[PDB]
UniProtKB/Swiss-Prot annotation:
This is Endothiapepsin. Its EC number is 3.4.23.22. The chain holds residues 90 to 419 of 419 of the full protein. Residues 17-328 form the Peptidase A1 domain. Keywords: Aspartyl protease, Disulfide bond, Hydrolase, Protease, Signal, Zymogen. One of its GO terms (biological process) is proteolysis. It is an enzyme of class 3 (hydrolase). GO terms for molecular function: aspartic-type endopeptidase activity. Transmembrane segments: none annotated. It comes from Cryphonectria parasitica (Chestnut blight fungus).
């Protein structure tokens, strides 16, 4: 089998992407944030505290003929941004882009933190990291990908995120029309439960490429590119008036600037992030200070190749016995 779904930015900044997901019988379509940095499929629901729902579409298990309470199971998750959610669990039929899994754990939120409530566009998350990170207790549950894998034509999914445009998540096949050149594959460590890999280095603008190992994760659920402070300082030093602002929470730059590109290595291959991908616009409405899309990973404890980096590539998440990542230009 295969599946193919369009993923759409939630706003004009590409802060996140939503992908429609069918849950239950008859189908309930929710728009979920596909997150290769976590492993829980959780949804706003009929169980979510009413004051914590503000415009989201909810899953109502009582209206699904295929829903079954997973008796005794609970979940609770905290993300890198300090957001959180928790609840109980149902199993149900879940379809993405025509690919159906039966008996998928659908984690029903009873509570969500304020950032989820305030984002009316995101009806929940669909985790695509390794199932070792799934938070369901006392019986850990599998991701949608892990449950689909054995049925797929090839044990892969691909992320093709757009810059200020829709993109595609495919499951079970590699669309050879979706990228240019060849795909460069690189090793993955699953030790932390992430799609963790090592970039071979970077360049700033038209500058020379610096060969250096940068371990980090491929995380579709993180908006920005978080790299070591040395790399990030080297980038922003090429932008007149850029500075790290403790008050704002990262590097800011004059909105009048033209940003340089940023290149990262994948083996001997190179992925170029255009300068405009690194512009996240005014820090507050009407400000002439703009927020940078490349930020320090200092304090976070891991480097994160988030959407800023991944949307410059066609990315293969290869879930074979020995997982690998692939990157191609596009």
């Amino acid at each position: 089998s295969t599946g193919s779904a369009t993923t759409t930015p939630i706003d004009s900044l590409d802060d996140a992407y939503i992908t429609p997901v069918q849950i239950g019988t008859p189908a309930q379509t929710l728009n979920l944030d596909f997150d290769t940095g976590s492993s829980d499929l959780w949804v706003f629901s009929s169980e979510t505290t009413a004051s914590e729902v503000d415009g989201q579409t909810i899953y109502t298990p009582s209206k699904s003929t295929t829903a079954k309470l997973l008796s005794g199971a609970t979940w609770s998750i905290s993300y890198g941004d300090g957001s959180s959610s928790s609840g109980d669990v149902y199993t149900d039929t879940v379809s993405v882009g025509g690919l159906t899994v039966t008996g998928q754990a659908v984690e029903s939120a009873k509570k969500v933190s304020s950032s989820f409530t305030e984002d009316s566009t995101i009806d929940g998350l669909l985790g695509l990291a390794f199932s070792t990170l799934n938070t369901v207790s006392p019986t850990q549950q599998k991701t949608f990908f892990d449950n689909a894998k054995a049925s797929l034509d090839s044990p892969v999914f691909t992320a093709d995120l757009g810059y200020h445009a829709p993109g595609t998540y495919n499951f079970g096949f590699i669309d050879t029309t979706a990228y240019t050149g060849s795909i460069t594959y690189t090793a993955v460590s699953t030790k932390q439960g992430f799609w963790e890999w090592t970039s071979t280095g970077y360049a700033v603008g038209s500058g020379t490429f610096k060969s250096t190992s940068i371990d980090g994760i491929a995380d579709t659920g993180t908006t920005l590119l978080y790299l070591p402070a040395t790399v990030v300082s080297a980038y922003w030093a090429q932008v007149s008036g850029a500075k790290s602002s403790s008050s704002v929470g990262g590097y800011v730059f004059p909105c009048s600037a033209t940003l340089p590109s940023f290149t990262f290595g994948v083996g001997s291959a190179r992925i170029v992030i255009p300068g405009d991908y690194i512009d996240f616009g005014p820090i507050s409405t009407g400000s002439s200070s703009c927020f940078g899309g490349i930020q320090s990973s200092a304090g976070i404890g891991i480097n994160i190749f988030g959407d800023v980096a991944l949307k410059a590539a066609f990315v293969v998440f290869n879930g074979a016995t020995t997982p690998t990542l692939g990157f191609a230009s596009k």
